[PDB]
Amino acid sequence: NYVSFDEQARDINIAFDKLFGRDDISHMNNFSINKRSYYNCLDQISDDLNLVLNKYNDLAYSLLEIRYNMATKENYTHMEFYSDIERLFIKNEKLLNVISDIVEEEYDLDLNQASKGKKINIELQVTDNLNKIYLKSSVLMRILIPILCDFNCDDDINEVLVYDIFKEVIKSFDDGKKNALNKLYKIIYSRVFETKYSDVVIWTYLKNMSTDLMIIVKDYFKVIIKKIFPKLKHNSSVISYLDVVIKQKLKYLFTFKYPISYKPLKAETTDDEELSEQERMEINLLRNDQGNSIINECSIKQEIAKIKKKYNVTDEVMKEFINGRELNSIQIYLVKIYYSNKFKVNSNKNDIFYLLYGMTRELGEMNFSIIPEILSCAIAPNVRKMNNRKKLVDKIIHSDKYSYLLKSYLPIKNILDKNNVILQLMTIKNAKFMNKENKEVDFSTDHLAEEVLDMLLCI
Amino acid sequence: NPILFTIIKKCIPSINKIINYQQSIDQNGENIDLTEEIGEDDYIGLVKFKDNFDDLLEKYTDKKKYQKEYDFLIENHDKIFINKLPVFSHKLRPATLLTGSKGKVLAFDEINNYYNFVIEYINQINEGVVSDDSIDLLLLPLLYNMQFYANNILTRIISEYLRGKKGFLRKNIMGSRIN
Amino acid sequence: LLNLYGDNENYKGFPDIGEHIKNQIIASRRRFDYNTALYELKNLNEMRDSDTPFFADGKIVDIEIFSNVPEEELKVQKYNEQVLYYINKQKEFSNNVYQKLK
Amino acid sequence: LLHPLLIKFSKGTYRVLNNRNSNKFEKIKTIFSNIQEGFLVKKIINNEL
């Protein structure tokens, strides 16, 4: 013997040094197990390894060829891996002969004389030859499980290739007659379709989810082929096992808790006048109006037209004033602040820049000096971070302008205490500004604070 | 093509029992031919129906009762078999994901159920990758079932959005609400 | 809630128990956003562009208030003043019965 | 007014009457498993009885 399964490592170790004396594979001689079914029943796997390797070593040497070819040549396309699997195990007739010889002896259950007195249909009746074929195929299924677990490509294509190899060895054990697969499909179809009329309520409700009879039939066939067949025992029946597991899975599917409950709205409301459930779910999702938006846009257009008219501005002034700079957040915020009472700022950049030229003219003709210079050129890419600056904060707070501003914000105090939006605006001092000559603009902290406070007072 | 299906069902009869698979089986697996009761060409499969459509027409076409239909199909022969099935936007079939304490509730129009069925079926046909002779009883019955759901989609859209008085044709085209 | 009735000393959001409503407006509420409120809450005595007022006519006779917020957080908010009155009064009544026919 | 309960009981009993080759006890339990405390009220109000 060479096989020993370690549950702690969840692996199966083969004594390759005893198999052929080559230690190149002994470095990674352990076969890994990931899927939970084999992680649950990785004992009959080793048992079948032993029971198929004890008879002679040309099967041992064949498994050696398998492992040596995967290890030396890990690279394998779908077609390449499939073809080499055919070459090394599937098309080795000696394996088929010896497995038949070792398996056909133990079969003792005889349904031939048991079914003589029984009554059963022609299509669903199972002969002993089919049972022997299924058991013989399942034995090679179990012995081949480790290597196809060693298949290293993607899990979707892992499942695809595993299912194809299984459906191929099923026909290979049957010499390509393509019969046992159809018999199993008929059994599954009959068992599933027996309850077409008994549970119409669920078969109707589940239609909301993407499920039906045929899809469930195909899914159950795939699951039966993939998982149930490995858990089989010699000197035992098959049909009863399949019926029990199919019925159990059907009940499990029927009784379940789905995450998202479904409730399709009816075709049409009965009243159809002044109220409707469809109308209600539409008014749940409605869009805004249009009149206020049109009025606001027209107000912006009139304002920009008046701005053009007053200062006889030409497009050359805009060309020499924009300098091609993009839009930064702080200038947009200030423009929104000052022109808030008349209207609101839209998203068109040309109108924003016209309003910014008006911004600069109107606040340069006044006593303000810092704000026009700040808004003239561009800003720094990043806003500087600064500490509390309580000293300057104390200066601004003790100023009568801060108290006067609070005298209008007194009714709402908790929100301001939580946010300190005035302090947020005051923290714009940290950010740098560069002129059209790239020279960093120097700003007086107290002067900036006083100008910002006056700006807030004159909103 | 779903639009032409009702015409073809009249040009030749028994289309419902000619694109379906009903292969029987004995105990061992040898097929049992029960074609004595059925006609000469019945239960052939859709994938074989398209290949031999030209020859199949001549057997069961009446030249003294369906003369107009026979000439129509000869002219438009390319659009008999389609390849892609369209689907319009959800602006006309809304669905809300409103949530509640008892759990999330999803409500939609009825047409969405069938649209979610054709996608599921076709997604379950192309799994096969390796070159393998697929068993007929596993693939052929699904094709006939899919065509059944494709036909019902055309009936549902024409019997709920246009034909009815509350449908779009007689409410938002010839009449309308107005500001 | 806007200060429709009264000055800043009495932030009467809604009419009193026996008073009569005016201008067919019972109460108007304005959405408030955390990002931009410096230029939005400058004057609460006048209506704005984006408001959601409620229209009714007559004389108000009966009110009743149901709350879902902790009282400690509601005790500090100055604008939510009148409610803090009525709710308290309401609770008082309930306490009375629990001490009257117990 | 007591119609919906009768309708529900008939729908439940037909399913268990049309059952084949299975244990009866589980289906009989499923007949009575679903009884909502707001069944009658919801069915009466929704159907505009």
Ordered DSSP codes for A34-51: -SHHHHH-TTHHHHHHHH
C-alpha torsion angle, residues A287, A293, A295, A298 (rounded to 10): -140
Total residue count of chain C as it appears in this document: 102
The answer to whether B85 and B149 are in contact (CB under 8 A) is no
Task: Report the chain B residue with the minimal C-alpha distance to residue A164.
Answer: B130
Q: How far apart are the C-alpha atoms of B133 and A106, rounded to whole Å?
A: 34
In this structure, the strands spanning B105-108 and A261-262 are: parallel
CA geometry: angle at A172 spanning A171 and A173, to 5°?
90
| Per-residue tokens: B21 | 């698979």
- The DSSP 8-state label assigned to residue A12 in this structure reads E
Residues C13, C16, C22, C25, CA torsion sign: positive
A79–B130 C-beta distance less than 8 A? yes
CB-based contact A148:A233 (threshold 8 Å): no
Between CA A167 and CA A148 the distance in angstroms is 14
User: What is the Cα–Cα distance from A73 to A69, expressed in whole angstroms?
Assistant: 5
DSSP class per residue in A221-278: HHHIIIIITTS--SSS-SHHHHHHHHHHHHHHHHS---SSEE-PPPSS-SS-SS--HH
Per DSSP, the three-state class of C20 is strand
The answer to whether A330 and A379 have CB atoms below 8 angstroms apart is: yes
Q: Specify the amino acid at residue B50.
A: K
**Closest C-alpha among A239, A233, A228, A231 to residue A127:** A239
CA A265 → CA A269, A285, B108, distances in Å? Answer: 9, 15, 6
Shortest distance, CA A294 to any CA of chain B (angstroms): 16
Spell out a b/e string for A79-117, using b for 16 or more CB atoms within 10 Å of the CB, else e. eebbebbeebbbebeebbebbeebbeeeeeeeeeeeeee
Question: How far is Cα D46 from Cα D29, in angstroms, rounded to an integer?
Answer: 28
Chain A residue numbers touching D19 (CB-CB < 8 A): 198
Residues in chain A whose Cβ is within 8 Å of chain D: 194, 197-201, 247, 251
Can you tell me the distance from the alpha carbon of B62 to that of B39, in angstroms, rounded to the nearest whole number? 17
What is the spatial distance between Cα B48 and Cα B140, in angstroms, rounded to a whole number?
10
Cα–Cα distance for residue pair A4/A12, rounded to 1 Å: 6
Tell whether B103 lies on the interface with A, counting CB pairs under 8 A.
Answer: yes
Buried-state track C84-93, b at ≥16 Cβ within 10 A, e below 16:
beebeeeeee
d(CA B21, CA A155): 33
For tokens 């308290």, the residue is C88
Write down the residue that tokens 């000055």 correspond to: C7
State how far residue C66 is from chain A, nearest Cα, in angstroms: 23
- Would the CB atoms of A214 and B135 count as touching at under 8 Å? no
Tokens at A269, concatenated: 């409301």
Alpha-carbon gap, residue C26 to C53, rounded angstroms = 8
* Nearest residue to C67 (alpha-carbon basis) of C43, C87, C95: C87
> What does this entry list as its resolution, in Å?
3.8
Report the alpha-carbon distance of residue A90 to residue B5 in Å, rounded.
47
Q: What does the DSSP assignment read for chain B?
A: -HHHHHHHHHHSS--TTTS-------SSS-----TTTS-SS-S--HHHHTTTHHHHHGGG--TTTSHHHHHHHHHS-GGGS--------TTSS-EE----TT--EEEE-THHHHHHHHHHHHHTTS---S-----HHHHHHHHHHHHHHHHHHHHHHIIIIISSTTSSTTTTTSS----
According to DSSP, the residues that pair with A31 across neighbouring strands are A12
Only one residue has tokens 């309708």, namely: D7
For residue A401, what are the contacts with CB-CB under 8 A and spacing of at least 6? A450, A453, A454, A457
Q: Give the H or E element holding residue A187.
A: helix A180-193
**Cα distance between residue A372 and residue B114, in whole Å:** 64
- Cα separation, A88 vs B125, in Å, equals 30
**Amino acid letter, residue A412:** I
Which residue, A29, A92, A85, is CA-closest to A58? Answer: A92
A180: number of Cβ within 10 Å: 19
Chain B adjacent subunits, 3+ CB pairs under 8 A: A
Instruction: Estimate the crossing angle of helix D39-46 against helix D3-17, to 10 degrees.
Output: 110
Q: Collapsing DSSP states into helix, strand and coil, what is residue D10?
A: helix
CA atoms lying within 13 Å on the CB side of residue D18: 14
Q: Which residues of D touch A197 (CB under 8 A)?
A: 18
Minimum-distance CB partner of B130 among A122, A164, A207: A164
Between vectors from CA A129 to CA A128 and to CA A134, what angle results, nearest 5°?
A: 100
Of A415, A416, A411, A375, nearest to A397 (Cα)?
A: A416
Name the nearest CA neighbour of A331 among A383, A267, A266. A383
Q: What are phi and psi of B51, to 5 degrees?
A: -65, -40
Burial B39-55 (b: 16+ CB within 10 A, else e): eeeebbbbeebeeeeee
The number of CA neighbours under 13 Å toward the Cβ of B153 is: 20
What value does the CA radius of gyration of chain C take, rounded to a whole number of Å? 16
CA dist., res. A333 & res. C82, Å (int): 35
Reading the block at residue A457, the tokens are 């007072």
Residue with tokens 């195909």: A218
In this structure, chain A runs to a length of 459
- Nearest Cα of chain D lies from the Cα of A215 at a distance, in angstroms, of 23
CA–CA distances in Å: residue B50 to residues A283, B74, B140? 48, 15, 13
CA–CA dist D24, D28 (Å, integer)? 6
Question: Residue C28: phi, psi to the nearest 5?
Answer: -130, 130
Helix runs in A54-121, H state only: 57-72, 78-85, 93-103
- Alpha carbons A250 and A253: distance in angstroms, whole number: 5
Main-chain dihedrals φ then ψ at residue C12, nearest 5 degrees: -75, 95
Q: How many Å apart are CA A355 and CA A335, to the nearest integer? A: 8
Q: Supply angle C-alpha A217, A200, D48, rounded to 5.
A: 145
A11: part of which helix (H) or strand (E)?
A: strand A11-14
- CA A243 to centroid of chain Cα atoms: 36
Place of tokens 């069961």: B60
Burial profile C31-65: b = 16 or more Cβ within 10 angstroms, e = fewer? eeeeeeebbebeebeeeeeeeeeeeeeeeeeeeee
Burial A48-57 (b: 16+ CB within 10 A, else e): bbebbbeeee
Give the single-character DSSP code of A25: G
Q: What is the gyration radius of the CA atoms in chain A, in angstroms?
A: 41
List, in order, residues 6 or more apart from A349 with CB less than 8 Å away.
Answer: A327
Task: Give Cα C50 to chain centroid, integer Å.
Answer: 19
Q: Residue B14 to residues B9, B24, B42, B71, B73: CA-CA distances in angstroms?
A: 7, 20, 9, 20, 18
C86 neighbors C65 (Cβ within 8 angstroms): yes
